[PDB]
Write a protein that binds this ligand. Structure first.
Ligand SMILES: [Mg+2]
Ligand SMILES: [Mg+2]
Ligand SMILES: [Mg+2]
Ligand SMILES: [Mg+2]
Ligand SMILES: [Mg+2]
Ligand SMILES: [Mg+2]
Ligand SMILES: [Mg+2]
Ligand SMILES: [Mg+2]
Ligand SMILES: [Mg+2]
Ligand SMILES: [Mg+2]
Ligand SMILES: [Mg+2]
Ligand SMILES: [Mg+2]
Ligand SMILES: [Mg+2]
Lengths: 141, 55, 125, 179
RNA sequence: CGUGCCUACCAUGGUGACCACGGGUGACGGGGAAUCAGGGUUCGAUUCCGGAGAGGGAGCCUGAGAAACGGCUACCACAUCCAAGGAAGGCAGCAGGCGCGCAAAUUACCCACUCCCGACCCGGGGAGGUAGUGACGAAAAAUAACAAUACAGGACUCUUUCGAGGCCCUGUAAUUGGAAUGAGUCCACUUUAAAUCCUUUAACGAGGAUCCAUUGGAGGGCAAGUCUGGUGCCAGCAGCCGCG
């Protein structure tokens, strides 16, 4: 099975260094395609510009029309369909707004209800969606 | 084709309810004292099968 | 009323000075000021009061003791010699009259740009 | 550049499971029994006991005639006796692991007030040791998390204060109302 | 100065499957940091040490020490004045401004402490220290607390008690004081180069209009409601299972 001699440690580290790439997490952490292929340029948050508002559908067991925003980024310049979280907020996210986006619970997968949305809206013109939903005074219109 | 007009439908159609004037709560250690006086060896009349912290 | 006791006591005969650590007792009112502790130490040393210095006062969180550093000197000329101007400023011996930022540096710049008679006219006037 | 101080210590036990029913019941009956505020000052005592247990297991790992073990074990026994958790009896390292959680809460400031009087409802004794009314010695004690050492253990007096010292803190309001 | 460091001649060598050579590093190297069996895994630009550079990159005077840039010379990219023949520049120093980005502080004061420089006790230092923003983060820690008075929910020592409550907690928008004490308001202290903050202390300073504690949740994981009213696979909730 293994190799258990006193001078076999080079063969051991060669075998482990070869077989360590087959894990998904190691290769997505130490392969450059998860920097040159993902959005954000490897960031956590990113500002963007509202391009359009898209009503997408839910999955097959669910039945809902989810409301999302196609976001033109500032750092990279790519297009991200980002999700409108709360009950309202479609009337609070307008065209050409400074929109901060983050993940849902995982960068790789998405939410099991929405097909192709990986990211979530937090801010609208330096005013958060929690502030626009409850508590604070008025929109920056 | 999915229309975007139904935004905040339940948030609009929800009847508003005025929050009634609830008295002030207790502090940190006072709230822990209330928890120890309420939900522990202070008052336990019944049998140890069912629990009643809210009903 | 108050009680002043010196714990640590050293004598520098080179500079004709005596260093001490002063604990002032407080079972009563507030922290006794700069003048009165100095006068009581002058009464306990039985000389003229215009020569003994003291600096620093803590407070041990309600009455208790206040700890400072006292300096008994035997010559007013030695007191004027061996002491810095900021501790002469408690009695007002040294006066600088220009405690201002950028004044000396702009004088340095006016003495760095021009040279000679124009420098003595501008940077010194 | 700057050189003042850079250090960080977290006297804070963080539990692995967040919501254990028996553990929450045990920690809240501990708080309600020994008069505490929140669970981070339970985790203070738990972290100190855990660090003492780590040092005790590190000492019990070594050989018995080891001089480092003798020195550090005698120092740990001396510090625990001067705290007052141990007795003058069992000076073994296994009894240190045999210690429990509630002994440090017993040796804190409020429980010594409970055992030696002027307690009057531990929740009020918290106020009596917070406000300047219970004073271990001439250096005034203010903070309730005060490990009462065994070397003095009895000096509970107060001077220039409200109930026995003197002064009119707010009774002058009632006197001016009656006058 | 010892050297293929360089030159003339001579020999054909030297390294590599024990990974050299060739690429990338979102690579300055360490002492270290996070992570709780042991073993390990991932960062270390960052206050200490050593290296490298002062927009890119080449050359050099002086000087013991530089290929120095708060030195110079010429090129490229920038870039200020111009009265159009010419002058003048290098904040990856301290403050600050533009752009950039999810993202990071005031054109403050002082050489008072520690050191350093110079002819020298005496001058200087955005080296540093102090002050302002600051919920990166670490420690201690009020937010209404407390003892009593009275109704009862009474678990309970005890006698057919429908109580003796010298054990008791709780709903009391109920009284009562210690009128506790703190935060703030300010005199005099003190710290301090001058001050502020810490502490001492004189006087105001709580009764639900108080001096108001929020952040998430209540099907399982995962502590906690088969409560009420609307919405009726719509809105939406839910990091997965799922609900509508
Ligand atoms: Mg997922
Ligand atoms: Mg690099
Ligand atoms: Mg670890
Ligand atoms: Mg390890
Ligand atoms: Mg070297
Ligand atoms: Mg250099
Ligand atoms: Mg630059
Ligand atoms: Mg330089
Ligand atoms: Mg510069
Ligand atoms: Mg609900
Ligand atoms: Mg549960
Ligand atoms: Mg919810
Ligand atoms: Mg959640």
């Amino acid at each position: 099975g293994k190799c258990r001699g006193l001078r076999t440690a080079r063969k051991l580290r060669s075998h482990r260094r070869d077989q360590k790439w087959h894990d998904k997490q190691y290769k997505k952490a130490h392969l450059g395609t998860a920097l040159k292929a993902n959005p954000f340029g490897g960031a956590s948050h990113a500002k963007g510009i509202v391009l359009e508002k898209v009503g997408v559908e839910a999955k097959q067991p669910n039945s809902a029309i989810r409301k999302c925003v196609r976001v033109q980024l500032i750092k990279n310049g790519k297009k991200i369909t980002a999700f409108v979280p709360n009950d309202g907020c479609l009337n609070f996210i307008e065209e050409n707004d400074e929109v901060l986006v983050a993940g849902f619970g995982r960068k790789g997968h998405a939410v099991g209800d929405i097909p192709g949305v990986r990211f979530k809206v937090v801010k609208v013109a330096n005013v958060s969606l929690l502030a626009l939903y409850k508590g604070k005074k008025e929109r920056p219109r | 084709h999915g229309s975007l007009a139904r935004a905040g439908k339940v948030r609009g159609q929800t009847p508003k309810v005025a929050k009634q004037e609830k008295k002030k709560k207790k502090t940190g250690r006072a709230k822990r004292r209330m928890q120890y006086n309420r939900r522990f060896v202070n008052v336990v009349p019944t049998f140890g099968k069912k629990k009643g912290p809210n009903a | 009323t108050v009680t002043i006791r010196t714990r640590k006591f050293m004598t520098n005969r080179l500079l004709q000075r005596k260093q001490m650590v002063i604990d002032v007792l407080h079972p009563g009112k507030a922290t006794v000021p700069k003048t009165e502790i100095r006068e009581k130490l002058a009464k306990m040393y039985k000389t003229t009061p215009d020569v003994i210095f003291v600096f620093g006062f803590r407070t041990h969180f309600g009455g208790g003791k206040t700890t400072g550093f006292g300096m008994i000197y035997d010559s007013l000329d030695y007191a004027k010699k061996n002491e810095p101007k900021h501790r002469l400023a408690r009695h007002g011996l040294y006066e600088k009259k220009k405690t201002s930022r950028k004044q000396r540096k702009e004088r340095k710049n006016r003495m760095k740009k021009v040279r000679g008679t124009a420098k003595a006219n501008v940077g010194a006037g | 550049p700057v050189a003042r101080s850079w250090v960080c210590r977290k006297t804070y036990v963080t539990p692995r499971r967040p919501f254990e029913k028996s553990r929450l019941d045990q920690e809240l009956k501990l708080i309600g029994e020994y008069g505490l505020r929140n669970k981070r000052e339970v985790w203070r005592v738990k972290f100190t006991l855990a660090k003492i247990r780590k040092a005790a297991r590190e000492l019990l790992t070594l050989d018995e005639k080891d001089p480092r073990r003798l020195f550090e074990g005698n120092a740990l026994l001396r510090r625990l006796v001067r705290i007052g958790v141990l007795d003058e009896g069992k000076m073994k390292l296994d009894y240190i692991l045999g210690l429990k959680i509630e002994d440090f809460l017993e040796r804190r400031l409020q429980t010594q007030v409970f055992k030696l009087g002027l307690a009057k409802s531990i929740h009020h004794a918290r106020v009596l040791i917070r406000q300047r009314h219970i004073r271990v010695r001439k250096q005034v004690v203010n903070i309730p998390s005060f490990i009462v050492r065994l070397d003095s253990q009895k000096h509970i007096d107060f001077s220039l204060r409200s109930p026995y010292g003197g002064g009119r803190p707010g009774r002058v309001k009632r006197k001016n109302a009656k006058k």
